[PDB]
Amino acid sequence: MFDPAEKYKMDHRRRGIALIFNHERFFWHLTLPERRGTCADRDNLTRRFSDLGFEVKCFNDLKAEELLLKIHEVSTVSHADADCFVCVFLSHGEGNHIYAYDAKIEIQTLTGLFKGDKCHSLVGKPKIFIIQAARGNTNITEVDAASVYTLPAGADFLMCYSVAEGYYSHRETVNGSWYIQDLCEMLGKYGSSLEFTELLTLVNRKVSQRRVDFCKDPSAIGKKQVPCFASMLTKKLHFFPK
Amino acid sequence: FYKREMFDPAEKYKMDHRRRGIALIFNHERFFWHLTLPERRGTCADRDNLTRRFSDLGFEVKCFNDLKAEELLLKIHEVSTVSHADADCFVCVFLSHGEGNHIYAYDAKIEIQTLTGLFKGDKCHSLVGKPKIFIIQAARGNQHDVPVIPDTNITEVDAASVYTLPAGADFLMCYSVAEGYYSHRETVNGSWYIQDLCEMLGKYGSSLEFTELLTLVNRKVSQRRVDFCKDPSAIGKKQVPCFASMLTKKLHFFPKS
Ligand SMILES: Oc1ccccc1CNc1cc(NCc2ccccc2O)ncn1
Numbered sequence: 001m002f003d004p005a006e007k008y009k010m011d012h013r014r015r016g017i018a019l020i021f022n023h024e025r026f027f028w029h030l031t032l033p034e035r036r037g038t039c040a041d042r043d044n045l046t047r048r049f050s051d052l053g054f055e056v057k058c059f060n061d062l063k064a065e066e067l068l069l070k071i072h073e074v075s076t077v078s079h080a081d082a083d084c085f086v087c088v089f090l091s092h093g094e095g096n097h098i099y100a101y102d103a104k105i106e107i108q109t110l111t112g113l114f115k116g117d118k119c120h121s122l123v124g125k126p127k128i129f130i131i132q133a134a135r136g137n138t139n140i141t142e143v144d145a146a147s148v149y150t151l152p153a154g155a156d157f158l159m160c161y162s163v164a165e166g167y168y169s170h171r172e173t174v175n176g177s178w179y180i181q182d183l184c185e186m187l188g189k190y191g192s193s194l195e196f197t198e199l200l201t202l203v204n205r206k207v208s209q210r211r212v213d214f215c216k217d218p219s220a221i222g223k224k225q226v227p228c229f230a231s232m233l234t235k236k237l238h239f240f241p242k
Numbered sequence: 243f244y245k246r247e248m249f250d251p252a253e254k255y256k257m258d259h260r261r262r263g264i265a266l267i268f269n270h271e272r273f274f275w276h277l278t279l280p281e282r283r284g285t286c287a288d289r290d291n292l293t294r295r296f297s298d299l300g301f302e303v304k305c306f307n308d309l310k311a312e313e314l315l316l317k318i319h320e321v322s323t324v325s326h327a328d329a330d331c332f333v334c335v336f337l338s339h340g341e342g343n344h345i346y347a348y349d350a351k352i353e354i355q356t357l358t359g360l361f362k363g364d365k366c367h368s369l370v371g372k373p374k375i376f377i378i379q380a381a382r383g384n385q386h387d388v389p390v391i392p393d394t395n396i397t398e399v400d401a402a403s404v405y406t407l408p409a410g411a412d413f414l415m416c417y418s419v420a421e422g423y424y425s426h427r428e429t430v431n432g433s434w435y436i437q438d439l440c441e442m443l444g445k446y447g448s449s450l451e452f453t454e455l456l457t458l459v460n461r462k463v464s465q466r467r468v469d470f471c472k473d474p475s476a477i478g479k480k481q482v483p484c485f486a487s488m489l490t491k492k493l494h495f496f497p498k499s
Pocket residue numbers: 146147148149150151152164165166402403404405406407408420421422
């Protein structure tokens with residue numbers, strides 16, 4: 001019968017793959033600013049997700065063709081023995097696009113690779129995309145306007161965004177992005193016990209509570225950050241120790 | 243003992259105000275002929291179903307049928323400017339067609355951001371830090387009717403068309419359908435999404451955390467199928483709802499003391 005507290009089965013041999021695409025610099029013709037602090041984000045995420053049992057694979061500054069080949073390769077291997085799939089993008093973005101080193105990629109192209117008809121072995125399993133991407137312009141805080149649409153996807157996808165329309169994303173050149181810092185803090189403390197959307201709700205609270213009334217750079221005053229997640233999940237999701 | 247101001251992973255919105263709050267329902271069944279939009283048989287079932295379920299949760303429900311865009315904006319602006327100091331939260335439901343960032347009123351499109359914008363920060367100080375929940379059943383009207391001036395249970399199937407827009411802190415934006423999928427409405431029984439939302443509200447609304455409840459709705463709806471005999475062309479037109487959460491705490495609707 002119907003179970004109001006049903007959970008995703010997370011008892012497979014493996015947790016699954018976590019991909020991280022990390023973009024620090026861009027081809028000069030794109031005239032996009034460097035993203036100092038993103039290496040801190042990459043390291044932070046790698047630790048958190050590997051502590052949760054993921055096989056973490058990171059890729060720095062791939063060209064779009066390279067990035068598409070890689071994510072296509074991952075979407076076509078068997079995930080039969082895995083609980084779930086995680087994909088993280090650390091870059092700049094605009095509308096439904098994220099930047100690779102040399103060109104834009106559509107987010108729907110990336111998520112479409114893992115829909116049921118294209119990736120049988122992930123059907124009914126969580127497919128989690130985490131996007132730190134906004135508009136490209138000693139610990140300095142850089143502030144970027146929200147630009148990437150908070151796009152949905154298929155059943156059992158969870159799309160997690162650093163910032164909503166009308167707000168601003170922040171990145172510290174030494175400590176990393178506000179959103180990734182808070183996400184990783186919460187993963188470290190609560191990742192292995194809390195329901196994951198409950199955890200993302202804590203991240204919403206942490207990030208939106210960061211004060212912007214007295215920034216070192218007076219131009220940044222008032223530029224609040226509010227993250228958000230778009231859930232198409234159909235069950236409760238936990239990452240209990242395997 | 244007391245709760246020091248330490249980060250609390252279990253934190254809940256305070257829901258012990260004098261009143262639960264207002265729930266507005268904007269119900270649109272037919273449209274000015276120039277819009278060339280089909281009527282939405284079944285929407286009154288949705289409206290009634292929602293009214294019963296939200297009233298049982300303690301909400302003061304106000305329904306408006308087929309308002310023009312000026313009228314609708316006036317009404318929602320009226321509600322955004324009164325004091326919600328004694329309320330737990332605010333709910334706003336749109337039952338209509340839509341496109342992009344727009345919902346249709348009777349005579350014109352309205353941008354969703356203009357409606358949510360009325361409840362942001364000190365535009366509506368007395369809702370700051372309280373849940374502001376928008377529920378949108380709106381998709382692409384099928385236009386095989388004319389640009390001219392004009393009971394069996396059939397399932398109408400409409401392509402997703404309304405952007406799954408976010409909003410400000412403590413907003414929760416609930417969508418009947420995601421990009422690339424299809425919204426379904428039965429001309430007597432009502433919309434798949436609203437039917438399943440209302441069934442879960444009745445069974446679990448006064449215990450379950452509300453986003454956990456919306457996740458059940460995701461499961462229920464994305465598992466539905468149309469009878470192949472009734473409409474073959476509706477085969478492979480699955481419905482995947484979604485919600486975009488900017489909430490910062492757990493939301494429950496326990497019975498008020
Ligand atoms: O969400 C943001 C973020 C930054 C700036 C502007 C916006 C508003 N625009 C958008 C746009 C958007 N588009 C994708 C789509 C297409 C068809 C149906 C549903 C759907 O979702 N989805 C979400 N937000």
